[PDB]
Each structure stands twice: as C-alpha cells, then as structure tokens.
Design a protein around this ligand. Structure first.
Ligand SMILES: Nc1ncnc2c1ncn2[C@@H]1O[C@H](COP(=O)(O)OP(=O)(O)OP(=O)(O)O)[C@@H](O)[C@H]1O
Ligand SMILES: Nc1ncnc2c1ncn2[C@@H]1O[C@H](COP(=O)(O)OP(=O)(O)O)[C@@H](O)[C@H]1O
Ligand SMILES: Nc1ncnc2c1ncn2[C@@H]1O[C@H](COP(=O)(O)OP(=O)(O)O)[C@@H](O)[C@H]1O
Ligand SMILES: Nc1ncnc2c1ncn2[C@@H]1O[C@H](COP(=O)(O)OP(=O)(O)O)[C@@H](O)[C@H]1O
Ligand SMILES: [Mg+2]
Ligand SMILES: [Mg+2]
Lengths: 193, 137, 146, 97, 901, 48
C-alpha cells in the first residue's frame, strides 16, 4: 500500500487527492514503524519470560533484574489486554502513547537482556556445547525450552552434521536427528520431554 | 604423510602444526583426519583480537565438549598473546597425558574437565604478511 | 617452582604474586619470554634490587637475543647464552647430559646404542645446519624437541 | 658546591649512601619517582626544609619543574612555590638530590 | 536476462550493446559477473576507477529482480572508512561482552531473518581497499567453510542466498590467500567508453530536470540537441581530453574527473539560460542566441575542466591546441589566450579584465582579511568556484601555501547567501572523528520513514565543510587514508554508517570543499583516484610580480592617505616590497629548512605593520617611512632564520633594496644598527634606542620580581629584541607564538614577563605523571571558559614536553586554527558553557538568541583573548614531525628562532 | 533568615528539596546519580 501510494503520488492527477493521500501515507509510515518496534519487543519478551519463568532461583541471584522484568512484564500484559479489547489495527495505532511506550519497553528489554551474561555462563558450563553459541541464541534456546521449534536453527552452531531434530506431533518426543539436506538418523531409544 | 605425522603427534599428546603456502590443503587435511576419526572439528579463523581470556574460554569449551580445534593463521595472534596461550596449551597437554596415564586442569583460574577426544591443531603460512613468530616454548 | 609465560596482564599479576611468595617463603620462580615486556622488565629489576630475598631463592627468566632487553636488568642479572653447541663432541655431551641415565639404562641393552646413534645423527645434521646454505637449503630448527 | 640541584649517576649506590650519611643530622627521607608516596614526601620536604633524595630519575616527574627552576613568589612576607595545583610555603633550608 | 538488462539499462540511462555495439564489452562483463555469481559465493570486481563495476553489479541486481521476482538488497560497506574494530566487533576487557561490528551486524541480521531476510537475494559489497588486516578474517567466510569466526567463539554460517563481493580499484596489497578464495571479474578501462559516458550525460540532460513540458526541460533538451555533435565520435571533447592527457598536471588526471567537471559546467550553463529567461519574460531565449552561447560555453568549459589544475602555460597550450583543431567561433586574439575570455549570456566572448576596474578601498579596512583586491585570476577562480558550489558538487583547491585558496572560496561564498562554511583543519593524525564532531555540533540526526537523515540545524541552509589540509592525513602501510575513504563514501554513496547502532545515515544539505598543497610537498600525499574522480581540482598559483605589484600598490595608496606628504612614495615602496619578497622567496626555500615558506601572507602582514604604525602618528618623513618599512621587513624575514649568515644577508639586502628604490635619502636616519620600535615609553608605536629601553626594562623586571616571579635575569640586546617581538605578537589579535631555542635560554620566563607587562594571565597545564588526554581536555575547557566567557586575556604557555600523544597536538592544532574545538564541550559541559556565555553576553551588553550565535560569540571572544605560546627545542626531525602533525604551528603561529646564546 | 529554615524543614521532612537543583544543576545531578547507580549496581531508566 505504501508503494502504491508513492506510485499515485507522482502522476497523473495527484493534486486532487494530495490532502488525503499525504495523511494516509503518514498513517502507513507510523503504523509500519509501530509494528517494526512491536515484533522486536514481542520476540524479546517471549524468551525473556521463558527464562524468568522456567528457571528457578533466579530472583535469589538476580533480584533487581527479576523485579524489573516483572515490572515491565506487568505493563506488557496490560498492553496485551488492551490490544485484545481493541483488536482493530487502526485502534491499536490510535492507542495513546503506544509508540514511545514500545520504544521504552524495547530499551528496558534490551538492558535486561544485556544484564544476563553472568547467568548465561553457568548454563554454558552446564551444557558444554553452549560455549559455541552466542548470548542472543542461548537466551532464545533457554527461553524456548517449552516451545521447541525455534531451536531447530540453532543445532547447526553446536553440532557438526546435525542441523535439525525429528520431533513427535505432541512436541514431547525427539525421534531422531537430521542433516541439512534430508539425511536422517532414527534413534533406538527416543528421549522424553 | 599428513595423516601419519598428525597421528604421531596425537599419540605423543602434542598438537599438529601443518605449515606451507596457501592452497596446499592444510585446513582441509586436518578436517578430513578429524572426520575420519569421527571427531567434531571446530575451525577458527584466529585474529590479533583473540584475547588470552577468549582463547582460554574457547579452550575450556573445546575441552568440555571433546572436540578438535583447528586454528588457521595462528601466527596472527601477536607475540605476547601467543606466549601467554602457550601456557594454556601446555596445561591441556598435561591433562591429556594425565588421562592417558575427575581428570581436570586449571584454565582461566577455574577448574575445568578435560575430555580425551579433543585436540589442538594450528595452521599457518610463514611470512604471509610479516606475521608473528611462534616462541620456542 | 612456578612457571609463568610473560605477555598478559594476568601473567604480570601472577608473576608479581609468585615472586612475592617466593621471596617470603624460599621457593623458586620462573617467568619466560621476557623480551616481549621491556617496560615491565624495568620495574621488575627495580623491585628485585629493592627487595631483600630469602637465602635459597633463584629467579630464572628466559629471553631471545633481543636489543630491546633493558641494559640495567641485563647488567644486574647473570647471563647465560644458549646457542646450538659448536662441534659433534659438544652436541653429544649436551645430548648425554640431557638424557636421563635411568631412562637410557632401561632394558634391553640396545636402547643406549640406539640413543647414541640418534645423538650422532643429530650432531651431524646440526653441524650441517651450521654449514648453510650448502649443508641444507634453509636454516631448519632441529633441536631438543625433535 | 652545586647551584642547580645535583643528579647523581651511581651504578653502585656508594654516592647514595654517602649522601644519606652526610645529611643524617638533617634527616633525609628516601623516595623514588615511581612511588605513590612521592608527592607528599616532596611537599613535606618543601614545607619543613628537609633534605630529599629521589631515586629512579629516568622516570622523572615533571611536577619537579618549578622546584628545579626555583620559581618563587614573594607576595608579602610569604615565600611561595607552586607544586601542581597547590601552593606551598617554601622553606629556605630545602635541598633535593 | 539480456532483454531484462536492456530494459533496466533503458530505465537507468545506461547504454546497452548487443555484443558488437559500443556497450557489448560492458554487457559481456555483466554476463560474466552473473556466471561467477552462479558458480561462486566469493567474488571480486577489480579494475581502474571509472570502469563500470558499480553499474554492472547494480544492473545485474535489477535484472535478476525483474527476472525471478525475488527482490535483491545490496549492503555497501567501506571497509577502510571505519576501523577494523567497528567493522567486525570488540570484546570489552572489563566485562566480557561482545558488541557487533558493521559486517557482523549485517550478516547476523540476515541470518536471523526477522523481516524475511533469508528469502531475499542479499549482496554484501565491500567498496574500498583490501589489505590482509581485515580480509584474512574473511578467509574462512570465503572458504568452503562459509563460517564467520569471532573471538568469543560465536561462529556465523553463510546462508546460500548471500553473496560477498569486493569492488576494488587494485589488488596491490592483497595476498594469494585472499586472491585464491574469490572469483575474479576484471573490468578494464576500455570496457567503459567515453561514448557511453557522453550518452549517459546527454540522456540525463534530456530527462530529470535540474529544477527539483517545463521551460527547464525545454532549455535542457535544446542545449543537449545543440551540443550533441561535439560529444559523439571523435568530435571535440574526446580529442581535447586525449590532448589534455599529455599535459602535466599537479593531481593525476583521470577521465571521469574532467568529464564530471564538464557536466557540472554545462548544467550551470543551462541554469544560466533559465535565469536569463526569468530575467526577461517578455523576450524568450532565441534559438540562434542559445546556439551561440552554448557553442562558446562548451569550449570555455572544456578548457577549465581539462586544464584548471594545470599552470598558466599548460592551459594556454590547451587553448591554442583547441584553437588549432576545432572549428568554433573564437575571439580574434594575437597574444591573450582563450582562458582569459569569458562567455556572456548574450552569446559573445568578453574579456575577464573588463569585469573589475581598479579599486580604492577605504583607509579603515584597507587591508582587512575580508578585503580582496580583484584581479584576473581572482575573478576567474571566483567564477569557477561559484560554478562548482552552485550544484553542491565537492571540489578541491590546490596550490602553494598562502596563494589565496581560502579567500577565493570565501569570496565565492559571499556570492551565495544560502550557504554556511565550517572550517576544518586536517592534520597527520586526522580521523573521521573530526568530521563526526563537526556533524554533532552543526547538524542533527533526524529519523525518517526512509531512514536516518543528517541535516544542518539551520533550515533552508547548506552546510559547507571546508577541509584545509586533505593531503596531510596519514596513509597506512597499505596506502589508504581513512578520512579520505570516509569523504569518498559520503560523496559517492551520499552518506555513511553510524557506529553506535550500525545504521546507514543519509546527508541532506551538506557539501565538502578541500584545500591542499601539491602532493610533492614533504608532508603531503597523493589522493586516491576513486575519491579524486568525484572532486574537480583547480590550481591556484602565486599571483606573480605583475599581479602582486598592483595588489599591494592598491593597499599602499589606500593607507598613504592620512598624510599627503608621503602619497607620492607609494609606487617605489610597493616595488621595494615586491622585490625584497621575491629575493627572499628565491633565496630561502623549503629544502634548507622546513619552515622557509614565503607567500603573499608576508606581504599582507607587511602592509598591516606599516598601516598600524602609521595610524596614530599623522606626521612622518621619508626616513621614518623607510625605517618602519625596514623594521617590518626584519620582523617578517629574519625572525624565522636559523643562520647568522642568512640574517646578515637579509639585513644587507634590505639595505640594498631600500637604497635602490629610495635614492637621495638620509642613510643614517633611515638605517640604524639596533633599529627597535616600542609602544611602552610613549602612547604610540614609535622607534626607541637601546639605552632608555634597557633602563625601562630593568625597572620593569625590578617590579616584576616581587609580583609574579622572583628569578633575577641578565639583560642584553637579544633579550630586548625578543621581548619586543613577544610584545608585538601579544598585541596582535589571535597572536600565537612559536619559540625555537635550547632549554634554559629564557623563553617561558621572557614570555611570562611580557604577559605581565601586557596584562595577560599566564596558564600552564602542570603536566605530571599519569597525566592524560582527559586532564588536557579539562585544562583546555578551563582556559577556553576563562578566555571566552569571563573576557580574560590569557597567555597560554605550552612546552613540547607537555605533549604526551597525538591527541594533545590535534586539539591544539584545531584551537590554533579556528579558535574553537568541536566536541570539547559536550552535554553538561556544553550546557554550562551556554549559560556562562549567555551571562557573558549580558555583561558585554550584546543581545543574543539561541545557542549558535552564542557559540559564535564565544569563539570570537576566544580568538580575541587567547594567546598561545609554544616552546620547543630545535631538531630537524622534530620540526618536520611538528610541521606534518600540526600545520597551525607553522601557519597561524609566528615563529621566532631564539636558538642558542 | 526564614529562607534557610524553610529549605532545612523540607530537607528534614522529605530527604529532598524541590527547586534546589534547577537548570544545569539538575543535569549535572542526573549525570552524577546515573554514575552512582551504575557503581552501586542498580539499573535505572529516565530521571524520575
Ligand atoms: N553502461 C553504461 N552506459 C553509460 N554510462 C555508464 C555505463 N556504465 C557506467 N557508466 C557511467 O560511468 C560512471 C562511472 O562508472 P561506475 O559508477 O560504474 O564506476 P566504477 O567502475 O565502479 O568506479 P570506482 O572504482 O571509482 O568506484 C557512472 O557514473 C556512469 O555515469
Ligand atoms: N587431497 C585433496 N583432495 C581434494 N581437494 C583438496 C585436497 N587437498 C586440498 N584440496 C582443495 O584445495 C583447497 C585448499 O584449501 P585449504 O585446505 O584451506 O588450503 P590452505 O589451508 O593451505 O589454505 C580446498 O578448497 C580443498 O578443497
Ligand atoms: N588579490 C589579492 N587581494 C588581496 N589579498 C591577496 C590577493 N592575493 C593574495 N592575497 C593575500 O594572500 C594571502 C593568502 O592567504 P590564504 O588564502 O588564507 O592562505 P591559502 O592560500 O593557503 O588558503 C592572504 O593573506 C591575502 O591577503
Ligand atoms: N637572561 C637570563 N639571565 C639569568 N638567568 C636566566 C636568563 N634566562 C634564563 N635564565 C635562567 O633560566 C631558568 C628558566 O629558563 P626557562 O625560561 O625555563 O628557559 P626555557 O623556556 O628555554 O626552558 C631560570 O631559572 C633562570 O635562572
Ligand atoms: Mg587454511
Ligand atoms: Mg564504484
């Protein structure tokens, strides 16, 4: 829609619809920016919530970080409820202060993310293959432990020929491993999730 | 000849150091030997920014996994970092000899377990760009 | 003994702590490849001159032949030059001094003869290295490791 | 008989112990340019008129430049010397080696 | 793919060839590039500058887009415009945390593919120089491993949709390891044709009007139609270019530089036609008049664009070659060349000498820096500079120091009210950080839907960054200047990458002007051909004797108006000044001593000295005029000399020139052995003798002992002369001092005594152990606050032992050159400075709004009040190093050679 | 005078004096407080 508005801007009779089209392209630009921020903040929050929920004794060793994450997750869930109350995309755009709230929430999620490498080093010590995985990808792996489909792209970093694993339809049994071109090895005894 | 020399180095619990000009098949030969022996081979394009702490961290990861580490252009690490890394290499080789005979040795002032399957390989070209000289130790 | 390889900040701290402990107690301490830190060798010589050590304490520190090595430390220390030994006799004497008698005397009796043959071959190739570039095309590094 | 303060080149320390023995009634504190307690030792020597022997002159501190030039202010009946940011009353019986 | 290539070449105003036509070689190179892109993931396009590599890969991207439907994204990284740490990333020694670099960030974003990056065709193009410092990290990426290995153990695999391309001018410093990995496409200079470039320029003239159907369109199409026969085949431009490649230029001549220069000239011609039509609405532009105007403007434009950087003899040779070879109506001129003739809007040749007559400047601003005496070369260069600046095209001013490059740019700027000039002085240790600090001070970063835009604070205003010493920044071991690569990236690609977030920044209203010395000078280096392609260069030589005599005769006549008895002694005085300057310049050269540079700046300071001596007097004989002339000659031609034989040569030749030009004068009353001048004994700057001056100076030291410094001194005539010179420099505005002599010779003490005489506060940085650049910046901030906010005159005494690294002398160079240091006051410091400057303006009585005018007032106050005295020991290598690293120490500082006793 | 004691009363009651830090003093205080919070180890956003 942005490309088509830009196309009708140039020619032939843009002067009639200029007043409406300028405001409409401004609306499209701001909604594009809003959802660009939103996708990043949602991707941050999903694995951050996974890490701060599944793992235990995090508040005992990282109390201020856990408290700040709870404080920002409360307003994130408030925005969840507000967006569910008004599911229209235009209404979400017309929510007051949503852009600056998202920018501030992105900054706080990034800071809390950057303040977690001390906890990540213990996980790297626990699983030795995690030493070849970056901080972002390790946080994604830990936060998506209950959601094992995003982990598929991370097996290439920490394995030689294993690029993906074979999973059951219940997402609780690992049937085997796979290579990057279709070759697969079926396990004798599958593990349980 | 590469396989014979590097397996002699492995049985002597020493690292392997193939050297020569570019395009002679050094990194690929190391990877081929590692794949024939069935090991996970990690290839590192090392730099002058490869800190002592960073090298120790990749050493502890490699030791805990039990994987092979190929360091291509190893003479780019600078003289003093290279001399400092020599101590970690010596400690890892001592741990490997101890395993040959809870087998751990200290790296980065911490106790880290060492696996028998790991190895250190370095690949270099002498005088590629006025690179560093390896200390005798 | 404590052996430290010079070239890192952790190495400098470890060398300082080991030197202080060896002065306090009386153990030996070593720190190698010192030609990479001449500015640190300056204050090392200064603190070694200032400090009064234990009666049984030796500080060994190795370097290559380098003009960057400070003159004050080079004058305060005791200098030993470790070059390849000129002569087949000198090479064999160094070889037999290096080889432990217990290891060379293990059964069977031909182990010592094989060690002597290796010593002769090593002396010949090292002297040929000395007679470059006609003994060998390049200056190879044949030594105690080989 | 020096006018400018002396720099002693002694590879043996005999002149150093000679100076320490010469100024014994006037107590020398022995300091080095690389010590942390050099600025306060120099300030105390300047204030109290004590002889001072500073070693390791190869790592010379340029804070000694006004002292070596004898840059002296005489505002009032007060004789002053500037050592860094602070201002110190210079004692007449001060000598540095 | 050939049909799609033809379509996008039609869209992009590019010439397509079927295989035997003009574009066949270029199309074949595009097809070969496509084949190597198929069979390899590591790629290099190698060839000389202006060969078609960029257009080849861009047209291939567009053709593949329109073929396969997948849309291609290109990431253009200059690997040399930034540091390797910013290119790849760092591990912080304090906290073990990894920050991504530019290439690492781009690759990681593609791998993550949050916005669907893996489904697109991604091409990462490295547009810059190649050395093993940064590409041996890409060895493993360009190998079959396809892994980017980082020091923290985080390895990044290369997805199959990503191609890594290098667009390099040459591979002089590339190793066989790097060469073996990448497939090579060799673009020769014959692949891209001047016929292709002419076709592109003509098509862009037919379309895409200059004013951002229309009369501008019609003017452009008519001009293109009438200049069409001169571009195709051999014609005129190709033969002129072929001849101009045989002439000797200062900068290395390239085809694309001259061609883009000529294209900008012709665009300005079309704009001139449009302006004429706007001026005359009743009478439109006649086609015959347009033909006559364009046919002459084209010859004028090719002459200037092909021999602007040559000397007068070579541009005359090019003009006579054109007159011999082309059938174009040219003015009937037996001796005067075509380069002295302009093209009027009516379509006829006009002399340049008819533009400006003889001027009579008023005696108040008789020789002020803002005053320019108009000459032939002056008006020609002003016209050329205005033509370059009108299209906001970057330019380079080249020539010997003091030849008038800065004032010509300022005079051309004064004809453009919509532009602002910010002065930057380059040094050996000049990085893009200087440009970034200038952007931080004078511009703001604005976030737009299309991207991040950097624009000046002044809306509707164009910012001109004037870089003074572009030749001087250091080349690395592999022949690259980082700031030159940065400027080339900002000129060609229209922006740069922000380091903080790896985000592309686009420039909106920002242009660049560069001054430089010829690259054969000891500190200077030749500029890269890729950068030099985008910048036309004009050579500004010295005026010469016939120009200098009238330039400074105007000043002599204008300042010899207060008294009518000496108005007849103006032409011989000017002749004597010109002759002595010529002999001094011929005698003392840079091959003897690094600081032996003589220029019209010394003549300007000569006129300044004579005028400021003649202001408060209002009666003086010829003997007194000759005495002040000789005193100014001494102070401007002996103070920098090292050898006593040179000093006595200058004294004897001053006597010879004065006696040659002023016969029948009192030799004793005009020439004296001491010859000193002072304003201490009286209220005016009148001559003094040694004895009473020595008595006065003895009394002043007697007072000075109990007030500031109780160090007794022994006087002599050298001491008296030295303190008089320091007094003169302290009286002059923006008077910076450079004293060369042995230590303990009494330089800082004499400077402190003269500062106490003149009421100047003395500041010393008090350097000690572990003294850092942060401490130096704090001391500089305190000095600048006291000098520019509290209206305090400060004599800033600095020693060569106080300089500890390159940052000290870089900040000092900027301060000496401009009176301001961009980036010195940031954040809370800048806010406190702004409040202090507002209070100071209130105290001074000036009423000032905003922060820009307040900062300009602060800079003016610092220029007025701050005097910097530099003290250092004589050494050949030391002098050469300081000349290379701080040009302001030898351009803005008056050098007095104290020497040994 | 009472101007001293009003400020002292507010300081004793609340631990803060509104209007005491104004202009560039507030900016300098904010920078120093950010540095102090970083040294203590807490992570704090904005000025409130
Ligand atoms: N096929 C073409 N037809 C017409 N003009 C062309 C064609 N290819 C290139 N040009 C012109 O040549 C100019 C210079 O070519 P190009 O931009 O490709 O430079 P390059 O070879 O990448 O040089 P550099 O090494 O300086 O980056 C372009 O600005 C364009 O106007
Ligand atoms: N024995 C071999 N058989 C097949 N290909 C080889 C062999 N040895 C080397 N090569 C090829 O030659 C190239 C050399 O690459 P590499 O091993 O990195 O050499 P170097 O380490 O000396 O740069 C590789 O691409 C590899 O595929
Ligand atoms: N026609 C002229 N009219 C007035 N001044 C001139 C003329 N030609 C040369 N000058 C003098 O030449 C000097 C050149 O100085 P400047 O342009 O600042 O240095 P650069 O040429 O290195 O940029 C100026 O001081 C100026 O006074
Ligand atoms: N004309 C003079 N008469 C007596 N002493 C002098 C004279 N000039 C310099 N000095 C001595 O030099 C010292 C300071 O020199 P200084 O001004 O620092 O020289 P520089 O600036 O060249 O290092 C003073 O202590 C003073 O005694
Ligand atoms: Mg290799
Ligand atoms: Mg290009």
């Amino acid at each position: 829609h942005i490309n088509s508005v830009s196309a009708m801007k140039l020619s032939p009779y843009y002067k009639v619809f200029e007043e409406d089209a300028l405001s409409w392209e401004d609306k499209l630009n701001r909604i594009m920016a809003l959802f660009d921020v939103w996708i990043d903040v949602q991707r941050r929050w999903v694995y951050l919530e996974g890490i701060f929920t599944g793992s235990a004794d995090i508040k005992h060793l990282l109390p201020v970080e856990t408290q700040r994450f709870q404080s920002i997750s409360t307003e994130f869930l408030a925005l969840m409820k507000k967006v569910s109350k008004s599911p229209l995309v235009m209404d979400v755009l017309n929510i007051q202060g949503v852009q600056r709230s998202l920018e501030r929430l992105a900054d706080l999620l990034g800071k809390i993310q950057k303040a977690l490498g001390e906890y990540l080093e213990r996980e790297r010590s626990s699983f030795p293959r995690f030493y070849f995985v970056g901080d972002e990808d390790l946080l994604e792996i830990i936060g998506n432990s209950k959601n094992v489909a995003k982990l598929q792209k991370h097996f290439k970093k920490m394995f030689a020929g294993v690029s993906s694993i074979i999973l059951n339809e219940d997402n609780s049994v690992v049937l085997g491993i796979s290579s990057r071109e279709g070759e697969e090895v079926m396990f004798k005894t599958p593990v349980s999730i | 000849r590469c396989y014979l020399t590097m397996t002699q180095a492995l049985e002597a619990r020493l690292g392997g150091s193939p050297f020569g000009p570019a395009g002679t098949g050094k990194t690929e030969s190391v990877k081929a030997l590692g794949h024939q022996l069935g090991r996970f081979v990690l290839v590192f394009n090392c730099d002058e920014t490869f800190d002592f702490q960073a090298m120790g961290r990749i050493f502890v990861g490699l030791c805990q996994v039990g994987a092979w580490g190929c360091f291509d252009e190893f003479n780019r690490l600078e003289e003093r970092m290279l001399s400092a890394v020599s101590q970690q290499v010596q400690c890892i080789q001592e741990a490997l000899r101890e395993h040959s005979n809870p087998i751990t040795c200290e790296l980065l002032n911490k106790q880290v377990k060492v696996s028998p399957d790991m190895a250190i390989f370095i690949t270099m070209n002498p005088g590629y760009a006025g690179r560093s000289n390896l200390p005798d130790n | 003994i404590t052996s430290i390889a010079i070239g890192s900040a952790e190495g400098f701290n470890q060398a300082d702590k080991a030197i202080n402990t060896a002065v306090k107690s009386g153990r030996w301490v070593m720190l190698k490849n010192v030609h990479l830190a001449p500015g640190w060798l300056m204050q090392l010589e200064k603190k070694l001159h200032s400090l009064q050590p234990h009666a049984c304490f030796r500080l060994f520190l190795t370097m290559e032949i380098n003009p960057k090595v400070p003159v004050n430390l080079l004058r305060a220390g005791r200098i030993f030059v470790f070059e390849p030994p000129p002569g087949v006799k000198a090479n064999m004497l160094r070889t037999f001094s290096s080889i432990p008698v217990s290891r060379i005397c293990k059964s069977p009796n031909e182990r010592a003869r094989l060690y002597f043959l290796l010593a002769w071959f090593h002396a010949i190739i090292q002297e040929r290295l000395r007679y470059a570039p006609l003994g060998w095309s390049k200056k190879y590094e044949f030594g105690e490791s080989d | 008989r020096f006018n400018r303060y002396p720099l002693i080149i002694d590879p043996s320390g005999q002149a150093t112990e000679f100076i320490m023995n010469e100024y014994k009634d006037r107590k020398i504190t022995r300091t080095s340019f690389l010590d942390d307690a050099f600025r306060k030792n120099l300030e105390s020597a300047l204030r109290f008129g004590n002889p001072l022997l500073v070693q390791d002159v190869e790592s010379y501190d340029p804070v000694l430049n006004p002292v070596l030039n004898r840059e002296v202010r005489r505002t009032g009946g007060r004789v002053l010397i500037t050592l860094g940011d602070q201002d110190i009353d210079l004692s007449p019986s001060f000598v540095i080696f | 793919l050939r049909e799609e290539l033809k379509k996008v070449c039609q869209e992009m105003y590019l010439t397509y060839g079927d295989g035997e036509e003009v574009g066949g070689m270029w199309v074949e190179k595009v097809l070969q590039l496509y084949q190597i892109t198929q069979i390899n993931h590591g790629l290099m396009m190698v060839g000389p500058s202006g060969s078609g590599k960029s257009m080849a890969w861009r047209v291939l991207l567009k053709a593949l887009e329109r073929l396969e439907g997948v849309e291609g994204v290109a990431h253009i990284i200059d690997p040399k415009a930034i540091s390797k740490d910013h290119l790849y990333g760092t591990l912080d020694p304090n906290t073990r945390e990894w920050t991504d670099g530019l290439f690492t960030h781009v690759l990681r974003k593609i791998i993550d593919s949050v916005r669907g990056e893996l489904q697109k065709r991604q091409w990462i193009v490295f547009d810059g120089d190649v050395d093993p410092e940064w590409v041996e990290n890409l060895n493993s990426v360009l190998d079959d491993n396809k892994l980017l290995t980082l020091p923290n153990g985080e390895r990044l695999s290369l997805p199959p949709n990503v191609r890594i391309m290098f667009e390099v001018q040459d591979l002089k410093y590339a190793t066989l390891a790097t060469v073996s990995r990448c497939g090579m496409v060799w673009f020769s200079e014959d692949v891209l044709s001047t016929d292709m470039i002419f076709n592109n320029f003509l098509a862009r003239l037919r379309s895409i009007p200059l004013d951002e159907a229309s009369p501008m369109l019609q003017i452009q199409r008519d001009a293109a139609t009438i200049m069409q026969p001169y571009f195709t085949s051999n014609g005129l431009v190709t033969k002129a270019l072929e001849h101009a490649f045989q002439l000797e230029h200062i900068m290395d001549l390239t085809r694309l530089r001259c061609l883009g220069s000529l294209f900008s000239m012709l665009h300005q011609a079309c704009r001139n036609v449009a302006q004429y039509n706007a001026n005359h609405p009743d009478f439109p532009m006649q086609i015959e008049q347009l033909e006559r105007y364009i046919q002459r403007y084209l010859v004028y434009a090719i002459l200037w664009s092909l021999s602007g950087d040559s000397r007068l003899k070579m541009r005359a040779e090019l003009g006579e070659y054109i007159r011999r070879i082309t059938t174009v109506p040219l003015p009937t001129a037996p001796n005067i060349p075509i380069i002295d003739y302009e093209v009027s809007i009516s379509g006829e040749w006009s002399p340049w000498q008819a533009k400006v007559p003889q001027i009579e400047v008023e005696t108040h601003k008789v020789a002020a820096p803002d005053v320019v005496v108009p000459t032939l070369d002056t008006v020609r260069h002003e016209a050329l500079l205005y033509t370059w600046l009108a299209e906001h095209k970057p330019l380079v001013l080249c020539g010997p120091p003091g030849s008038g490059k800065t004032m010509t740019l300022f005079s051309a700027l004064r004809a453009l009210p919509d532009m602002e000039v910010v002065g930057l002085n380059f040094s050996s240790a000049t990085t893009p950080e200087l440009l970034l600090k200038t952007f931080d001070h004078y511009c703001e970063y604005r976030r737009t839907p299309n991207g991040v835009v950097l624009a000046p604070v002044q809306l509707g205003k164009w910012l001109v960054l004037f870089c003074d010493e572009i030749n001087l920044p250091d080349m690395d071991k592999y022949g690259t200047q980082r700031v030159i690569s940065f400027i080339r990236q900002m000129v060609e690609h229209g922006g740069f990458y922000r380091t903080s977030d790896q985000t592309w920044v686009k420039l909106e209203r920002i242009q660049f002007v560069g001054a430089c010395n010829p690259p054969t000078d000891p500190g200077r280096k030749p500029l890269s051909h890729r950068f030099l392609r985008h910048v036309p260069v004009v050579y500004v030589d010295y005026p010469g004797p016939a120009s200098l005599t009238q330039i400074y005769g105007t000043f002599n006549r204008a300042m010899l108006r207060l008294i009518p008895s000496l108005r007849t002694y103006a032409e011989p005085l000017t002749a004597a000044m010109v002759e002595f300057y010529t002999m001094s310049q011929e005698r003392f050269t840079q091959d003897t001593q690094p600081h032996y540079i003589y220029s019209p700046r010394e003549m300007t300071r000569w006129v300044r000295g004579i005028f400021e001596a003649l202001r408060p007097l209002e009666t003086l004989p010829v003997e007194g005029l000759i005495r002040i002339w000789a005193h100014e000659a001494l102070r401007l031609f002996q103070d920098r000399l090292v050898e006593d034989e040179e000093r006595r040569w200058t004294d004897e030749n001053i006597d010879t020139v004065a006696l040659k030009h002023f016969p029948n004068i009192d030799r004793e009353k005009a020439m004296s052995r001491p010859i000193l001048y002072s304003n201490w004994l009286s209220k005016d700057y009148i001559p003094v003798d040694q004895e009473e001056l020595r008595d006065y100076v003895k009394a002043r030291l007697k007072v000075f002992y109990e007030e500031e410094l109780d160090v007794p001194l022994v006087l002599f005539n050298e001491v008296l002369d030295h303190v008089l010179r320091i007094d003169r420099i302290f009286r002059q505005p923006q008077g910076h001092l450079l004293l060369i002599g042995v230590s303990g010779a009494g330089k800082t003490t004499l400077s402190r005594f003269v500062a106490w005489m003149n009421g100047l506060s003395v500041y010393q940085i008090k350097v000690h152990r572990k003294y850092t650049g942060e401490d130096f910046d704090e001391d500089l901030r305190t000095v600048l606050r006291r000098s520019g906010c509290k209206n305090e005159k400060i004599a800033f005494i600095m020693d060569e032992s106080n300089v500890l690294d390159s940052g000290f002398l870089e900040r000092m160079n900027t301060l000496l050159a401009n009176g301001e240091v961009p980036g010195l006051f940031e954040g809370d410091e800048y806010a406190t400075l702004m409040t202090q400057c507002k209070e100071g303006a209130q105290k001074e009585g000036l009423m000032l709004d905003s922060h820009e005018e307040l900062y300009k007032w602060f800079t003016s106050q610092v220029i007025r009040n701050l005097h910097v005295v530099f003290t250092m020991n004589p050494s050949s290598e030391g002098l050469k190093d300081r000349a290379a690293t701080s040009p302001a120490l030898f351009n803005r500082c008056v050098l007095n050679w104290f020497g040994d006793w």
